[PDB]
């Protein structure tokens, strides 16, 4: 065995563990989610596991979807000098075209044999795994300050008397047993002798700190396009209440969509409809209020 | 909240020393004023003085011998049916220091 | 919060020096008032005076020899069942400087 604990400022190591674990957790959660936002009229007719596509797109490798046996299996694809042949690395096994491939972008609208590359972002300047590191430390220390604020927001009622058995019988039989009408000696024995340590310099501070945590989440959120935007259009709470500057959050949402524009180039080739929409739906009540067809009653209940 | 009193102390310690108030010699002496203990504490004779000066003031006397009886009288008949604070007799030695 | 007291200190150090309170010579002496330690600390004899002047006041005496007994008495019987602050005896040397 080996044991000799520090003190009870162990909490001052537990506090910094909460901050450190919050940064690690929020960082890898936020990129645990971020490669699924778009999902684009999900599997109309096309054999793509779009989850495996979007995970590949957020490590910035240019995937290439084409035909394999007329059914659109993904492949990897790493002034205008045109690409034609299957020179690139190919991830499937025997489903390779073994024939004339092409990029279907500008050779014509809708004619050439399909192997179209899809960028994550049309013009690439900085990776957004750096922006997610940029705010999560700032977010980490505001989560530190919230946790440190509510950890010292606890309150005792200090009794103050010369020690051995004068005031103990008082609080036992007449405060925590709830008793009104306790009788005492005239020796100033509650003339502000019992005192309260309060932290009312802490609870007005508490709510404003939560609002700073909240709008910093929102200021990370609208950067990476994930937004509450369309419902904010129909709710009429459009500007300076949701302090987000709508023209910037509809801006950063749009860059990721027109990065995945070459799926429309593919969609024009084989005669089908694939639009890169932007997912904001969460179900069992939204699907109920949009239909209210009695077959949807036998589906849910 | 309730603990030991001080009338009960010197009553019990004086009844430890052979005294009584009901059947003292052989006759019924409950009504006789020179025998029950409350008169012995208000008169504050030699006897109660000895038991206070041994159990309460265990190592004290004042300067004179006429003032010292006055102080011990004015202490022990102000506080007969009062209380005790520090929970045990021969352990409220706070009395000796406030002396 | 609880640590060492001061009654327990001089009780344990006086019982280190061969004394006892129950079976002292051979007869049962629990009830005999001149043997148990609380009376030796309230009377504050030569013996407790020696052990306080060696373990608590390890290099001190006051000016006179009649006041100095009064100060050491008025210290050690105010603080018998009190407490200790700096967590170790022979390490509350804060007592010697506040002396």
């Amino acid at each position: 065995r080996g044991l000799n604990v520090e003190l009870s400022k162990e909490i001052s190591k537990r506090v910094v563990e909460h901050r450190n674990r919050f940064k690690r957790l929020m960082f890898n959660r936020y990129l645990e989610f971020l490669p699924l936002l778009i999902n684009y009229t999900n599997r109309d007719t096309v054999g793509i596991d779009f989850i495996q596509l979007e995970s590949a797109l957020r490590q910035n490798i240019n995937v290439v979807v084409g035909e394999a046996r007329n059914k659109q299996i993904m492949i990897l694809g790493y002034q205008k000098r045109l690409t034609k042949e299957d020179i690139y690395f190919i991830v499937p096994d025997y489903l390779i075209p073994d024939d004339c491939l092409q990029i279907h972008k500008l050779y014509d609208n809708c004619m050439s044999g399909n192997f179209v590359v899809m960028q994550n972002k049309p013009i690439q300047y900085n990776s957004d795994i750096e922006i997610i590191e940029h705010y999560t430390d700032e977010l980490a220390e505001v989560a530190l300050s919230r946790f440190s604020l509510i950890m010292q927001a606890k309150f005792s009622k200090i009794f103050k008397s010369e020690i051995n058995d004068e005031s103990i019988n008082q609080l036992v039989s007449e405060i925590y047993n709830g008793a009104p009408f306790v009788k005492m000696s005239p020796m100033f024995n509650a003339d502000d002798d019992i005192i309260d340590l309060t932290s009312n310099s802490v609870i007005p501070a508490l709510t404003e700190m939560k609002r700073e945590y909240q709008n910093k989440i929102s200021e990370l959120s609208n950067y990476l396009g994930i937004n509450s935007l369309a419902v904010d259009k129909e709710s009429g709470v459009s500007d300076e209440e949701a302090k987000s500057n709508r023209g910037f959050t509809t801006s950063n949402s749009n860059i990721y969509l027109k990065g995945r524009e070459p799926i429309t180039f593919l969609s024009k080739r084989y005669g089908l409809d694939i639009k890169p929409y932007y997912d904001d739906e969460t179900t069992s009540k939204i699907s109920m209020v949009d239909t209210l067809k009695d077959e949807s009653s036998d589906i849910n209940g | 909240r309730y603990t030991m009193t001080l009338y009960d102390f010197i009553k019990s310690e004086l009844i430890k020393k052979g005294f009584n108030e009901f059947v003292n010699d052989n006759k019924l002496t409950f009504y006789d004023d020179e025998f029950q203990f409350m008169q012995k504490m208000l008169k504050f004779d030699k006897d109660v003085l000895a038991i206070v000066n041994e159990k309460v003031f265990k190592g004290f006397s004042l300067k004179d011998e006429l003032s010292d009886l006055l102080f011990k009288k004015s202490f022990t008949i102000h506080f007969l049916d009062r209380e005790i604070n520090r929970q045990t007799v021969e352990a409220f030695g706070m009395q000796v220091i406030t002396v | 919060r609880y640590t060492m007291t001061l009654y327990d200190f001089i009780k344990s150090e006086l019982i280190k020096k061969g004394f006892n309170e129950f079976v002292n010579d051979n007869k049962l002496t629990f009830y005999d008032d001149e043997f148990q330690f609380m009376q030796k600390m309230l009377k504050f004899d030569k013996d407790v005076l020696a052990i306080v002047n060696e373990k608590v006041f390890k290099g001190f005496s006051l000016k006179d020899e009649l006041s100095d007994l009064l100060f050491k008495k008025s210290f050690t019987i105010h603080f018998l069942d009190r407490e200790i602050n700096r967590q170790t005896v022979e390490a509350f040397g804060m007592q010697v400087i506040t002396v």
Binding site: N164, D165 | M4, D8, F9, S12, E13, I15, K16, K55, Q87, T88, V89, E90, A91 | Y7, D33, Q36, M38, Q39, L80, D81
Partner: peptide
């Protein structure tokens, strides 16, 4: 209910417990 001390009597037992508290006298 209505906690009453219906006896209120006289005693003949004696006490000087040479001890700091009730607790140390129990010890």
């Amino acid at each position: 209910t209505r906690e009453r001390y219906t006896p209120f009597y006289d005693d003949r037992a004696d006490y000087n417990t040479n001890s700091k508290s009730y607790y140390d006298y129990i010890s």
